[PDB]
Design an enzyme around this catalytic site. Structure first.
Site, PDB file in Angstrom:
ATOM      1  N   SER A  82      80.930  23.223  79.932  1.00  0.00           N
ATOM      2  CA  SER A  82      82.146  22.633  79.377  1.00  0.00           C
ATOM      3  C   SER A  82      82.036  21.123  79.162  1.00  0.00           C
ATOM      4  O   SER A  82      82.901  20.509  78.536  1.00  0.00           O
ATOM      5  CB  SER A  82      83.311  22.880  80.339  1.00  0.00           C
ATOM      6  OG  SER A  82      83.084  22.285  81.634  1.00  0.00           O
ATOM      7  N   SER A  94      88.526  18.714  80.184  1.00  0.00           N
ATOM      8  CA  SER A  94      87.198  18.617  79.556  1.00  0.00           C
ATOM      9  C   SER A  94      87.123  19.590  78.380  1.00  0.00           C
ATOM     10  O   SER A  94      86.332  19.392  77.435  1.00  0.00           O
ATOM     11  CB  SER A  94      86.071  18.928  80.557  1.00  0.00           C
ATOM     12  OG  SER A  94      86.189  18.130  81.742  1.00  0.00           O
ATOM     13  N   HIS A 139      52.479  31.008  41.849  1.00  0.00           N
ATOM     14  CA  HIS A 139      51.615  31.803  42.725  1.00  0.00           C
ATOM     15  C   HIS A 139      50.382  31.004  43.116  1.00  0.00           C
ATOM     16  O   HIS A 139      49.407  31.593  43.584  1.00  0.00           O
ATOM     17  CB  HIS A 139      51.155  33.133  42.032  1.00  0.00           C
ATOM     18  CG  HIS A 139      52.279  34.056  41.631  1.00  0.00           C
ATOM     19  ND1 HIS A 139      52.720  35.099  42.433  1.00  0.00           N
ATOM     20  CD2 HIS A 139      52.996  34.142  40.477  1.00  0.00           C
ATOM     21  CE1 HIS A 139      53.704  35.745  41.816  1.00  0.00           C
ATOM     22  NE2 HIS A 139      53.878  35.197  40.619  1.00  0.00           N
ATOM     23  N   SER A 186      41.999   8.139  59.876  1.00  0.00           N
ATOM     24  CA  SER A 186      41.180   8.824  60.864  1.00  0.00           C
ATOM     25  C   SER A 186      40.434   7.893  61.813  1.00  0.00           C
ATOM     26  O   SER A 186      39.713   6.964  61.363  1.00  0.00           O
ATOM     27  CB  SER A 186      40.123   9.677  60.149  1.00  0.00           C
ATOM     28  OG  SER A 186      39.312  10.381  61.092  1.00  0.00           O
ATOM     29  N   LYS A 192      39.384   7.242  55.069  1.00  0.00           N
ATOM     30  CA  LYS A 192      40.324   8.341  54.791  1.00  0.00           C
ATOM     31  C   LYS A 192      41.762   7.853  55.031  1.00  0.00           C
ATOM     32  O   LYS A 192      42.012   7.095  55.958  1.00  0.00           O
ATOM     33  CB  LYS A 192      40.003   9.547  55.702  1.00  0.00           C
ATOM     34  CG  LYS A 192      40.578  10.904  55.268  1.00  0.00           C
ATOM     35  CD  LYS A 192      39.939  12.034  56.078  1.00  0.00           C
ATOM     36  CE  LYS A 192      40.606  13.406  55.852  1.00  0.00           C
ATOM     37  NZ  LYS A 192      41.810  13.615  56.710  1.00  0.00           N
ATOM     38  N   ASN A 250      45.809   9.667  55.008  1.00  0.00           N
ATOM     39  CA  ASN A 250      46.485  10.955  55.035  1.00  0.00           C
ATOM     40  C   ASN A 250      47.976  10.804  54.700  1.00  0.00           C
ATOM     41  O   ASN A 250      48.557   9.727  54.922  1.00  0.00           O
ATOM     42  CB  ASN A 250      46.313  11.549  56.426  1.00  0.00           C
ATOM     43  CG  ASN A 250      44.845  11.775  56.781  1.00  0.00           C
ATOM     44  OD1 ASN A 250      44.047  12.228  55.941  1.00  0.00           O
ATOM     45  ND2 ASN A 250      44.480  11.468  58.027  1.00  0.00           N
ATOM     46  N   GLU A 281      53.982  14.707  56.564  1.00  0.00           N
ATOM     47  CA  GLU A 281      53.753  15.326  57.868  1.00  0.00           C
ATOM     48  C   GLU A 281      54.922  15.099  58.817  1.00  0.00           C
ATOM     49  O   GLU A 281      55.310  15.998  59.605  1.00  0.00           O
ATOM     50  CB  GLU A 281      52.452  14.810  58.476  1.00  0.00           C
ATOM     51  CG  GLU A 281      51.221  15.443  57.823  1.00  0.00           C
ATOM     52  CD  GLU A 281      49.916  14.730  58.123  1.00  0.00           C
ATOM     53  OE1 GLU A 281      49.871  13.918  59.057  1.00  0.00           O
ATOM     54  OE2 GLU A 281      48.923  14.995  57.404  1.00  0.00           O
TER      55      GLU A 281
END
Lengths: 457, 457, 457, 457
Positions: free
Chosen positions: D96, D131, D179, D310, D316, D318, D323
């Site tokens: 509660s 409450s 597809h 990396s 590299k 990313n 993400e």
């Protein structure tokens, strides 16, 4: 026994008396996974859709009237359910619904052939179309018809049934319960008024999804650009559909790429049904708890007997309808998680989870429509309250001391409750024994009237 | 056309040629919700179970041999699937499965009556039993048979198919990808070895659930106490079941109250299937991505053509099997959430969500068994790698500079990668142009061999 | 106040007294999303892991002992929790954990610099490593330590507490309840023996996940090939980890590609915890229901008072611990769905959902470990049964007629139950009034003894 | 160091300098589960709410102005965030929110005591309240403020950013993909127009929940009856809240029992956020795929560099923002399942899952608001398209044969596509080689223009 058909990939054996052709048959062999195919309402939607597209193609001079009319007639037989057994393709097919789209085109072609007319499944029956706009279109027509024509009316019956009990039990006083523990009084009618509101809010919830559930991709063809469809094809088909079905809720997509790259309206619609399932679990749980016993439970109400309870324990009867409702609610929740997982998994110009999303959403509409009406009619309507027991339950709660707070303060009030329970005596007795009167004798009684405590409107 | 039957609640009209009786018919009227009834494997389990209980009752002298033998024979017809259309009760029935239990008892009674023998559905066919132990027992037999006889073998085919590709493509070098960006080299075979391990681990996962999935409540009767069942009834029935089915995995419950108050083993089993669905989504996604194109995607492999891709775009072919796999994975996830919601909702001596839990779990077994074999045979086995393209992909990644780290340090290495990309030149050229050689010319080459970089076992 | 640091992308302002450097600071600016960073146990795992890798690099002659030893010492300070406030990166960072890996490397570099030694975050602290093997490695160490050292012991306390009540209440007879309705008798001890078994089975469930949860990617470096790591690096690091932590459950990955391309062991582990949550919902629900009242509920037991129930209703006390348990169970279920969604979303050589999966899994371990012990000690241990009320509950159920089935048949038995309830009389009275005795008077009594009916072991 | 306080259950040691008192301290000891307490926005809502109730109690003559004014001032300090560290109670408290309600009452009491005024936590600070209405009220105020003031504006930024790209890239032609396979042309702008629509529809979705999310229980007190609250208290408090916050969306509950017995509006609100998470997964996935490479992926666009990719592979970079977005989407989905499980688990007059539901819903608002703005500004705004590569991608697809369908028919068209791919030649060449021209030479070219094929508005 078989005949030979072909498609652009080559020759396929098809059962001699099957109205489907090469591509349907490949899908039969490619996807033996669940062995459940499209539902009645999906097959219907595909039929209506094909009829509507043929009409528009006729109207625009793009399709020979003899061929259009035979496609419209064939599609109508499909829409009416004369050919459901000519739709053997699994739900778990290519995620665009290509196979079921072709299944519809091929069955129409074979019906029309039987009526003297040669129509090509692609070139004529699928003229101005893709699976990529037609399959989601049929899915959203089915979902919208399910919402408007089945679920909402079913919920309205359930709402009426609950509201009738809210009225009937207006002054049927009982102990409220919070945390499962003795609380201050309410009426059985108030509780049912709450359940009725949950169902009314559910109706509102489904309605609020219709502006986007009713969007149709029709006209966007392969990727949303409308290539190979004439100008305003979608609006024209939607007009025919609205005219034929009476569903004014059906409409052209706001953005023709969003309408094919995603099935966000199906996830939205499922969210409303999942909320309804949450509400129904609470309503059903409460009702079976109120019905519990007859001797070792709450025994507040009596539910109508529907069948013998137990193969082993003679005479027992169980709340089978609340059990059906709560199990349906679980299924809707499961279905809803399946729908959202597929919804999130689109890529570029096409979300290819449509058949799985459609299966799950349409099932939730169905289960909820059917169980809501049964619950209303075979359970709620015949509920009988145990009025005298309920009035004793109200007058036994220790928390009937609560309205003395403003006169004696929370701390002395709590001293009354702890002393009354250890004595097995009443609140009135513990306060008069505690010497608190002098707060008068007449005032203590007025505040301790339980039906007055419930504050009935 | 109808006949009259009765039960303890009164008289009910039953179709004249129906082998079921009063209680089944009430359930028909009480639960028209989904219009899907028990699966073949559930009906089978109920048949076997009834045969086994009759045998034990015979063995213990509690049931007349003539009646027992007719119950065993009738139950056998049911087990073999001669009477599936005599089981019309909805999945969404009373949550103990009482109705389907009685449906089995009544159908046996009517078959036996037709063979000259009078057996009472309760007093004889249900002797020493409750729905409360028999329905979950039949559910766990079905689930265990599904795991052992269908899913595990299907997964083993899929495992073999993936491992065969791991071997075939051992030295087929390609660019690894992390975050979707160019990484250091791997072999196609390594990737498939990963997928094979996910499937092998899946097998382990299902196996790890069998010690508790195979527990049967049989013998606990109404609430787990075994009242009205003779001593050691459960162990005796389990022995017959193990003897008849060959499923050594079947066993008596560790605690007979836990075995009826909960269906925790079904939630456990679904967790293993949900993990398999998570693994299959990754495997299938990767494969359709490797197959993407032919000109605008990755075009690493070629999947076998299964059907014409598109009603509208001629010549296109789509990864329909990966689509079936990923949609199945969504369904398993949905089903799994439904199972757990029901599992958590038990009360005191009985969890009354069994039919819904059974439906969902058994479907997940089926979808996964069927799609795994199709995926193995109609997709994985015929995959063809584009070896020359793949070797160029490997040799084009900028990250082939990585093995120079120990010789020139991370920071100078990164300077080589940024300069090589802005020039459209090779890593070898950018390092020799950067004056880093002097790290020899012969050493730079050895470290830059891509298949050596993949570190093939 | 700030200082300048750089990385390969350029210069970044970093707080002057922060031990982290450029890359950590970029992640601070890039991911202000939840404002919650890594947990104590994750930071610990990263520390241990870095210490272990430095040791192996030292052992193999690849890393200067002075630098190795300072990295080992620095890593040890991190492992011990002296530097948790030097880890400000959000959970919702790059999905490989690159940023937290670099955060660890940079903090070690700055600690070592303060001790007179210059170590490069990449070239030395990250020698022979990637985030792609180290971050999942640290995650699986944390998860395995959580399972073995925290959850299992907590569950064992809960198991002991429940089993102690199973023993204590062995002969405390009460009415069983099925479907919430009056059933045949059980003992309170039997019910608790069921709950104890659910917890014991939960222990088994977590244990069954350890062979795959304990797999570590360490050694697979960027994509699983082990490039830039010496031969047998992973096995060597695992040996150090097993030696330092005592966790024999930690092991090298079965397949080094599966161990990075997926986090299937985390989904598996969460499935076991979700099953435990399902079990705990049932246990807690039952207990708060048994505790319900004192006057308007079941009032079977009394739970220990933990705090004043209500700000408004004086004297009320609520089952707050069962409420904490059931809310935790919801969170575990939610967390579990999050884990699986991330698990399914891997691509090629790396699943980039690791931080989100780790956060959710580790939280479920924690919530379950902490609430299980509280539930055992502050609720279960002090439960007091209302033995006399319970014996009356048992003797009041109508279903005490059930053991007369074999003597009078199911149908006559049901006639006794319906007549006894309409009269407000006993089962013994309704059968003797029904003229059934002649089934003797002495036999009716023996079968109607409720504690004998419960069939106590 | 400690002082002694008491409540109705007895004496409790409380830290000497803590502003909380007995009941807060019991909750500290009772619920050490997650060690995370209420969020800033929840503490704020409680402060505002207490100020508003004190004002109304003052207005109605029920509370001494000196005490009211000190409660209003104290509550204001809490609302402003001067005392967040005086709120140590776990999320996983009594369901509660009693404990956090009392935590607010006690902290106000201690602040007021320090300003010379004696106010009782129950009798004054909690006057006219429970409450059971205040905690859900504070939760719905927090949720509504989060929707209106944080999420919707954040989504509007994201919408603007996507729509700006839809405009910028209007004629940037590329190959569509369905597809994952080569489709007919679209523009990058069309795709972004789809993403923009998904976000606009998301805004609509959140807005559609506000009529019920904004309902407040305030005034219903213990069980919904309003006992111990004056007439129209709720409407009066809501008016003050609307006046102080500017949130016109806040309103009195339609039914005061539904508003406490359930938290259906929180489940509804979460459904809208879960739909947004589904949409964001698609948008983010597409964007990181378009960004994939630079050499082994699609390389359609370039995302802004945010940090070194990396620890191991130099150079590299990313897609870290996509993400973060996709991981947030997983968390929202998890949170949503937790919310619904708690929502379904109400009983009689109170759903006691409020703190867990609030935690999860508020977190989803926060994660989505924060990541949407970051995604817009640090990713979407700086995306750069590779226009020449994209135009080649469009002109390479085999499916550019599609608009020849009406002239040569689906079957001959498919023959052109299969022959063009086996030759490594163009569609124009395969049709002119196939002798189909005679369909003119001028017509073949017009239909094969790729930007005309995209059908730009």
């Amino acid at each position: 026994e078989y005949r030979i058909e072909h498609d652009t990939m080559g020759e396929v054996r098809v059962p001699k008396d099957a109205l489907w052709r090469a591509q349907t048959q490949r899908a039969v062999e490619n996807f033996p996974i669940s062995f459940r195919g499209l539902e009645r309402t999906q097959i219907r939607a595909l039929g209506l859709l094909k009829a509507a597209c043929a009409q528009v193609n006729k109207d625009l001079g793009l399709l020979d009237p003899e061929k259009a009319d035979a496609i419209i007639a064939a599609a109508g037989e499909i829409a009416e359910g004369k050919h459901d057994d000519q739709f053997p393709i699994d739900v778990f097919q290519t995620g665009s619904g290509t196979s079921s789209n072709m299944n519809t085109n091929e069955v129409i072609a074979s019906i029309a052939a039987a009526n003297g007319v040669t129509v090509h499944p692609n070139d004529h029956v699928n003229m101005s179309q893709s699976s990529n706009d037609t399959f989601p279109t049929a899915t959203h027509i089915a979902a919208t018809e399910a919402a408007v024509r089945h679920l909402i009316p079913a919920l309205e019956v359930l709402h009426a049934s609950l509201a009738a009990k809210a009225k009937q039990w207006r002054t049927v006083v009982k102990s409220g319960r919070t945390h499962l523990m003795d609380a201050v009084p309410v009426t059985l009618g108030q509780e049912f008024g709450g359940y009725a509101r949950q169902i009314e809010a559910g109706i509102e919830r489904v309605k609020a999804t219709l502006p986007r559930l009713g969007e149709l991709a029709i006209g966007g063809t392969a990727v949303g650009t409308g290539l190979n469809a004439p100008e305003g094809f979608g609006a024209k088909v939607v007009e025919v559909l609205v005219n034929e079905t009476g569903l004014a809720e059906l409409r052209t997509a706001v953005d023709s790429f969003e309408a094919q790259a995603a099935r966000d309206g199906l996830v939205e619609a499922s969210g409303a049904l999942r909320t309804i399932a949450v509400s129904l679990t609470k309503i059903a749980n409460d009702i079976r708890w109120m019905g519990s016993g007859p001797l070792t439970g709450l025994a507040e109400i009596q539910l109508p007997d529907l069948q013998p309870g137990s193969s082993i324990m003679p005479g027992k009867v169980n709340p089978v309808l609340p059990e059906a409702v709560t199990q349906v609610a679980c299924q809707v929740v499961g279905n809803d998680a399946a729908i959202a997982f597929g919804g999130a998994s689109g890529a570029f110009e096409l979300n290819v989870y449509i058949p799985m999303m459609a299966r799950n959403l349409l099932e939730s509409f169905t289960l909820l429509s059917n169980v809501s009406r049964l619950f209303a009619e075979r359970c709620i309507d015949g509920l009988v309250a145990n009025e005298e027991r309920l009035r004793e339950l109200a007058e036994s709660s220790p928390s009937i001391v609560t309205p003395l707070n403003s006169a004696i303060g929370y701390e002395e009030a709590a001293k009354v409750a702890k002393q009354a329970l250890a004595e097995k005596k009443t609140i009135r007795q513990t306060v008069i024994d505690r010497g608190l009167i002098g707060l008068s004798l007449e005032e203590l009684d007025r505040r301790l009237d339980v039906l007055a405590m419930a504050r009935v409107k």
